[PDB]
Design an enzyme around this catalytic site. Structure first.
Site, PDB file in Angstrom:
ATOM      1  N   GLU A  32      70.350 107.717  -3.597  1.00  0.00           N
ATOM      2  CA  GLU A  32      70.270 109.057  -2.996  1.00  0.00           C
ATOM      3  C   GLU A  32      68.833 109.563  -3.072  1.00  0.00           C
ATOM      4  OE1 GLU A  32      72.281 110.283  -1.205  1.00  0.00           O
ATOM      5  OE2 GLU A  32      74.337 109.581  -1.721  1.00  0.00           O
ATOM      6  N   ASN A  71      74.803 118.486  -0.756  1.00  0.00           N
ATOM      7  CA  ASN A  71      74.730 119.033   0.618  1.00  0.00           C
ATOM      8  C   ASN A  71      75.028 120.534   0.632  1.00  0.00           C
ATOM      9  OD1 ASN A  71      75.239 119.591   3.365  1.00  0.00           O
ATOM     10  ND2 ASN A  71      75.983 117.534   3.821  1.00  0.00           N
ATOM     11  N   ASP A 118      73.093 118.037  11.357  1.00  0.00           N
ATOM     12  CA  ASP A 118      73.939 119.238  11.546  1.00  0.00           C
ATOM     13  C   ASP A 118      73.172 120.485  11.101  1.00  0.00           C
ATOM     14  OD1 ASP A 118      74.207 119.132   8.753  1.00  0.00           O
ATOM     15  OD2 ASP A 118      76.400 119.302   8.768  1.00  0.00           O
ATOM     16  N   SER A 144      72.361 121.067   7.917  1.00  0.00           N
ATOM     17  CA  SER A 144      72.537 121.169   6.445  1.00  0.00           C
ATOM     18  C   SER A 144      71.390 120.364   5.822  1.00  0.00           C
ATOM     19  CB  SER A 144      73.882 120.683   5.941  1.00  0.00           C
ATOM     20  OG  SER A 144      74.040 119.283   6.200  1.00  0.00           O
ATOM     21  N   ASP A 170      70.392 118.128   2.073  1.00  0.00           N
ATOM     22  CA  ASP A 170      70.787 117.493   0.795  1.00  0.00           C
ATOM     23  C   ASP A 170      69.662 117.715  -0.227  1.00  0.00           C
ATOM     24  OD1 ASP A 170      72.987 116.427   2.193  1.00  0.00           O
ATOM     25  OD2 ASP A 170      72.080 114.508   2.390  1.00  0.00           O
ATOM     26  N   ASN A 199      69.878 116.993   7.397  1.00  0.00           N
ATOM     27  CA  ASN A 199      70.974 116.344   8.142  1.00  0.00           C
ATOM     28  C   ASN A 199      70.877 116.768   9.603  1.00  0.00           C
ATOM     29  OD1 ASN A 199      72.769 116.951   5.122  1.00  0.00           O
ATOM     30  ND2 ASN A 199      71.912 114.998   5.745  1.00  0.00           N
TER      31      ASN A 199
END
Ligand code: NA
Length: 129
Positions: free
Chosen positions: A35, A59, A48, A50, A52, A46
């Site tokens: 990660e 998220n 969308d 969002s 992380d 992301n």
């Protein structure tokens, strides 16, 4: 902060992540490796909108507030910034909620694709724990 492998394994253990929801410590270290490469300041946007955040790339769609993810929740009741701290307490506490949400560590797509089923004990091998 960029943790060492065994340094992060010891921090996760201290915060009770070892065998949490039945996931051995090597699972958590493996997920953090892929990660964030063990960097607490890791961020990823992301498609969308969002974001992380942190060692386990938690998220903003569900888990933290960043003020810029329309329609999102904050189920860990934290600013996403708290997930970038040198102190992993907020990331660990929030990861416990995530892994309890029904799909275990599949919530972390990198864990499913790169850790699940592998010799995850290698990630804590040689560490004084
Ligand atoms: Na949010």
């Amino acid at each position: 902060k960029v943790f060492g492998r065994c340094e992060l394994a010891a921090a996760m253990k201290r915060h009770g992540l070892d065998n949490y929801r039945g996931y051995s410590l090597g699972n958590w270290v493996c997920a953090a490796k892929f990660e964030s490469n063990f960097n607490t300041q890791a961020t990823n946007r992301n498609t969308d909108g969002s974001t992380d955040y942190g060692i386990l790339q938690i998220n903003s769609r569900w888990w933290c507030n960043d003020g810029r993810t329309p329609g999102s929740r904050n189920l860990c009741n934290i600013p996403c910034s708290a997930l970038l701290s040198s102190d992993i307490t907020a990331s660990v506490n929030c990861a416990k909620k995530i892994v309890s949400d029904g799909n275990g560590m599949n919530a972390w797509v990198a864990w499913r694709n790169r850790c699940k089923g592998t010799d995850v004990q290698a990630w804590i091998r040689g560490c004084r724990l």
